[PDB]
């Protein structure tokens, strides 16, 4: 096989079009991506035109987190009621506008001090389910020591997200960084998988971007594909970033990246 139709057939596979959204923006809750909440897909197609329009952030191991959610095939999110006693929740920012108001990532709770007191937070979450939980949390990096003190009443914030198997400790990096939507600060995003029977543990003294719940980790038969090809009304079992392709011939030279039953390369 050597030619492609140029379009991605919406059948028989479940095709979810990202449009102006990446997977991580839909994962975190960028207000332009709220329409992607809880969505299921067999193949999720990221676009080149996808862009971030919320609070500026990085993900240290971006490639692997993008692989976990892509395989689960779902963005299903179940809220949990953490006991954030003594802190101000629902932190908002003018860089992440939702419905003409200052907002933030839908799936993230940015905690600030309460009455200029912000105590050592300790929360346990048991994961009594029969399936892997994916917790998404972050670390805020204030621009100045003045910004650190004003937000958290703590010059040296520390964060530790632990389980019975793993532990992650992150320290903020105070400093100036190029203004993104008028924000010289940033946020580092991390994730933790809590397997059934294991407890999620959080030990934040400052700067925490608290999670709001978990994502379900399903059987990884789904995947992700970078492609600019349009989504079309047709039926084809093989899918390549150049478009859908028939699977009658035994070999193909269109693209090495494929999804579904495809000819060998």
């Amino acid at each position, epitope marked *: 096989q050597n030619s492609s139709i140029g379009e991605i057939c919406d059948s028989p596979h479940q095709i979810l079009d990202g449009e102006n959204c990446t997977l991580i923006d839909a994962l975190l809750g960028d207000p332009q991506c709220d329409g992607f909440q809880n969505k299921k897909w067999d193949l999720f197609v990221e676009r080149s035109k*996808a862009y971030s329009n919320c609070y500026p*952030y*990085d993900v240290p191991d971006y*490639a692997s987190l993008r692989s976990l959610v892509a395989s689960s095939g779902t963005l299903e999110f179940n809220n949990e009621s953490f006991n954030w006693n003594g802190v101000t929740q629902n932190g908002t920012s003018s860089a992440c506008i939702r419905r003409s108001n200052n907002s933030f990532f839908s799936r993230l709770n940015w905690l600030t001090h309460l009455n200029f007191k912000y105590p050592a937070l300790n929360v346990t979450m048991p994961n009594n389910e029969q399936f892997d939980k994916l917790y998404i949390w972050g670390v805020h990096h204030p621009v100045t020591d003045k910004d650190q003190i004003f937000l958290y009443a703590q010059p040296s914030g520390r964060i530790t997200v632990s389980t019975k198997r793993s532990q992650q400790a992150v320290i903020p990096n105070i400093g100036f*960084r*190029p203004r*993104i*939507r008028n924000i010289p600060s940033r946020i580092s995003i991390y994730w933790t998988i809590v397997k059934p029977g294991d407890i999620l543990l959080i030990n934040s003294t400052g700067n925490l971007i608290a999670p709001r719940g978990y994502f379900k980790i399903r059987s990884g038969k789904s995947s992700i594909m970078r492609s600019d090809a349009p989504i079309g009304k047709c039926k084809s079992e093989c899918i390549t970033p150049n478009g859908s392709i028939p699977n009658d011939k035994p070999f193909q030279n269109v693209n090495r990246i494929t999804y579904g039953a495809c000819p060998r390369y």
Partner: antibody, heavy 122, light 108 residues
Framework: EVQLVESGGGLVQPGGSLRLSCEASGFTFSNYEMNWVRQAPGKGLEWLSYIRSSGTVTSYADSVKGRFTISRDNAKNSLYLQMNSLRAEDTAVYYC???????????????WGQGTRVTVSG | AIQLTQSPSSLSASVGDRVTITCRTSQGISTPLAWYQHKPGKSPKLLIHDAFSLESGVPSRFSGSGSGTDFSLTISSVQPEDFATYYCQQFYDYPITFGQGTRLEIRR
């Protein structure tokens, strides 16, 4: 016109010192963060240093931190880079550039210096 | 530090084509990348928003897309004066870092 004129480049012995100047005109020098960038012959662009518009806020590339020093004088609309303990690899064409911050978001370095050559050789 | 890898290093494109250059980050970032045109014997200029395009007219023929890890620079119509060595830079976190550069080679 928006100008960033550069001066101070030349030939210098290894271990010697040299100072560069990026005089600005056309825009308000007091509001832009200034940068020093170089490319060595046969190499690509290399960011070196940066000052904030208010001064006293600097950081350096690891290649030159401890040797070079960036500085600002808003009164004379000029940027200075003090180069000390110069080595052979420091031979490059040094550029100066401001940060474009339209509305509230950074877009890149729009206005660039003309280029000034520093050759470290015996 | 955030490191960039740029692909390809050399590129020969015929006139009037559409050419895309890719840069990849070591760490995923939400901010886009900035691109530069480096003519021989000239200072590099900002590509994505040249001259006073933000203050004045929006139209331009250099497109810079990509979020996360893979970003791209697209030239809508290759012209005989596009010969340069293009560079990409990230502005998420200092130190500011560039790529190895892509030398476009207009073909006649």
């Amino acid at each position: 016109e928006v100008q960033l004129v550069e001066s101070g480049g030349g030939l210098v012995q290894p271990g010697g010192s040299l100072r560069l100047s990026c005089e600005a005109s056309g825009f308000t020098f007091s509001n832009y963060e200034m940068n020093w960038v170089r490319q060595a012959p046969g190499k690509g662009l290399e960011w070196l240093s940066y000052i904030r518009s208010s001064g006293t806020v600097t950081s350096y590339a690891d290649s030159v931190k401890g040797r070079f020093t960036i500085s600002r004088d808003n009164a004379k609309n000029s940027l200075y880079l003090q180069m000390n303990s110069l080595r052979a690899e420091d031979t490059a064409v040094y550029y100066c550039a401001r940060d474009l911050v339209y509305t509230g978001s950074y877009y890149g370095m729009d206005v660039w210096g003309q280029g000034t050559r520093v050759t470290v050789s015996g | 530090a955030i490191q960039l890898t740029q692909s390809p290093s050399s590129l020969s494109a015929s006139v009037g084509d559409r050419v895309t250059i890719t840069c990849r980050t070591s760490q995923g970032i939400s901010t886009p990348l900035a691109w530069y045109q480096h003519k021989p014997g000239k200072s590099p200029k900002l590509l994505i928003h040249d001259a006073f395009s933000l203050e004045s007219g929006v139209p331009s023929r250099f497109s810079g897309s990509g979020s996360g890890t893979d970003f791209s620079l697209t030239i809508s119509s290759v012209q005989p004066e596009d010969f340069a060595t293009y560079y990409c830079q990230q502005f998420y976190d200092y130190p500011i870092t560039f790529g190895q550069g892509t030398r476009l080679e207009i073909r006649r």
